[PDB]
Write an enzyme that holds these catalytic residues in place. Structure first.
Site, PDB file in Angstrom:
ATOM      1  N   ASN A   1       7.050  11.286   3.665  1.00 34.21           N
ATOM      2  CA  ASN A   1       7.612  12.453   3.053  1.00 34.21           C
ATOM      3  C   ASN A   1       8.996  12.950   3.596  1.00 34.21           C
ATOM      4  O   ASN A   1       9.192  13.112   4.808  1.00 34.21           O
ATOM      5  CB  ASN A   1       6.567  13.612   3.164  1.00 34.21           C
ATOM      6  CG  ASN A   1       6.935  14.814   2.281  1.00 34.21           C
ATOM      7  OD1 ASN A   1       7.720  15.655   2.694  1.00 34.21           O
ATOM      8  ND2 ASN A   1       6.429  14.859   1.055  1.00 34.21           N
TER       9      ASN A   1
ATOM     10  N   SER B   1      10.146  17.750  -2.411  1.00 28.95           N
ATOM     11  CA  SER B   1      10.261  16.651  -1.471  1.00 28.95           C
ATOM     12  C   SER B   1       9.890  15.351  -2.194  1.00 28.95           C
ATOM     13  O   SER B   1       9.367  15.390  -3.302  1.00 28.95           O
ATOM     14  CB  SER B   1       9.325  16.872  -0.230  1.00 28.95           C
ATOM     15  OG  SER B   1       7.954  16.723  -0.661  1.00 28.95           O
TER      16      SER B   1
ATOM     17  N   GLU C   1      -1.583   4.269  -1.174  1.00 29.86           N
ATOM     18  CA  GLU C   1      -0.382   5.103  -1.240  1.00 29.86           C
ATOM     19  C   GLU C   1       0.680   4.500  -2.143  1.00 29.86           C
ATOM     20  O   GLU C   1       1.344   5.227  -2.871  1.00 29.86           O
ATOM     21  CB  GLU C   1       0.220   5.301   0.162  1.00 29.86           C
ATOM     22  CG  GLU C   1      -0.634   6.185   1.110  1.00 29.86           C
ATOM     23  CD  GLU C   1      -0.465   7.659   0.836  1.00 29.86           C
ATOM     24  OE1 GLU C   1       0.264   8.007  -0.098  1.00 29.86           O
ATOM     25  OE2 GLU C   1      -1.164   8.451   1.489  1.00 29.86           O
TER      26      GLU C   1
ATOM     27  N   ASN D   1       7.278  15.317  -5.232  1.00 28.89           N
ATOM     28  CA  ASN D   1       6.237  16.346  -5.096  1.00 28.89           C
ATOM     29  C   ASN D   1       6.726  17.676  -5.656  1.00 28.89           C
ATOM     30  O   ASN D   1       7.894  17.878  -5.811  1.00 28.89           O
ATOM     31  CB  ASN D   1       5.866  16.532  -3.582  1.00 28.89           C
ATOM     32  CG  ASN D   1       5.418  15.228  -2.955  1.00 28.89           C
ATOM     33  OD1 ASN D   1       5.927  14.797  -1.928  1.00 28.89           O
ATOM     34  ND2 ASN D   1       4.497  14.596  -3.586  1.00 28.89           N
TER      35      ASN D   1
ATOM     36  N   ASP E   1       8.215  11.240  -1.545  1.00 25.48           N
ATOM     37  CA  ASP E   1       7.511  10.318  -0.641  1.00 25.48           C
ATOM     38  C   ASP E   1       8.097   8.918  -0.828  1.00 25.48           C
ATOM     39  O   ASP E   1       8.331   8.485  -1.935  1.00 25.48           O
ATOM     40  CB  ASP E   1       6.015  10.242  -1.016  1.00 25.48           C
ATOM     41  CG  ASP E   1       5.270  11.578  -0.744  1.00 25.48           C
ATOM     42  OD1 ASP E   1       5.679  12.370   0.111  1.00 25.48           O
ATOM     43  OD2 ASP E   1       4.313  11.806  -1.448  1.00 25.48           O
TER      44      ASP E   1
ATOM     45  N   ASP F   1       7.050  20.537  -4.353  1.00 26.46           N
ATOM     46  CA  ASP F   1       7.926  21.317  -3.495  1.00 26.46           C
ATOM     47  C   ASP F   1       9.363  20.792  -3.469  1.00 26.46           C
ATOM     48  O   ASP F   1      10.217  21.379  -2.845  1.00 26.46           O
ATOM     49  CB  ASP F   1       7.361  21.427  -2.090  1.00 26.46           C
ATOM     50  CG  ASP F   1       7.238  20.056  -1.382  1.00 26.46           C
ATOM     51  OD1 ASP F   1       7.721  19.042  -1.894  1.00 26.46           O
ATOM     52  OD2 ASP F   1       6.663  20.026  -0.286  1.00 26.46           O
TER      53      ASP F   1
END
Ligand SMILES: [Cl-]
Ligand code: NA
Length: 129
Positions: A59, A50, A35, A46, A52, A48
């Site tokens: 998130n 959002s 990750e 991301n 991370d 959308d």
């Protein structure tokens, strides 16, 4: 902070991750490696809107507040910035909430595609634990 593999395993073990909800330590170290490459300061945006954050790439849509994810929740009750700290306590405590929410570690896309069903014990092999 960029953790060493064994350094992180010992950190996570201390914070109660080993066997947490049945997931052996190796699963968490594996997830963190893929990750964030063990980098507490990792961030990724991301589609959308959002983002991370941190070593476990938690998130902002559900888990933390970054003030820029409209209509999002803050289920971990923390600013997302707190997930970037050299101290992983905030990330660990929040990950415990995530993995208990019903989908287990499947919530981590990298774990599902790169750790699940593999010899995850290999990630803590050789470590003084
Ligand atoms: Cl599970
Ligand atoms: Na949020």
């Amino acid at each position: 902070k960029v953790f060493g593999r064994c350094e992180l395993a010992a950190a996570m073990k201390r914070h109660g991750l080993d066997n947490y909800r049945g997931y052996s330590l190796g699963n968490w170290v594996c997830a963190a490696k893929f990750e964030s490459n063990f980098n507490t300061q990792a961030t990724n945006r991301n589609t959308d809107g959002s983002t991370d954050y941190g070593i476990l790439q938690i998130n902002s849509r559900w888990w933390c507040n970054d003030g820029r994810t409209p209509g999002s929740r803050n289920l971990c009750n923390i600013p997302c910035s707190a997930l970037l700290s050299s101290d992983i306590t905030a990330s660990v405590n929040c990950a415990k909430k995530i993995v208990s929410d019903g989908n287990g570690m499947n919530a981590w896309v990298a774990w599902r595609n790169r750790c699940k069903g593999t010899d995850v014990q290999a990630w803590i092999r050789g470590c003084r634990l």
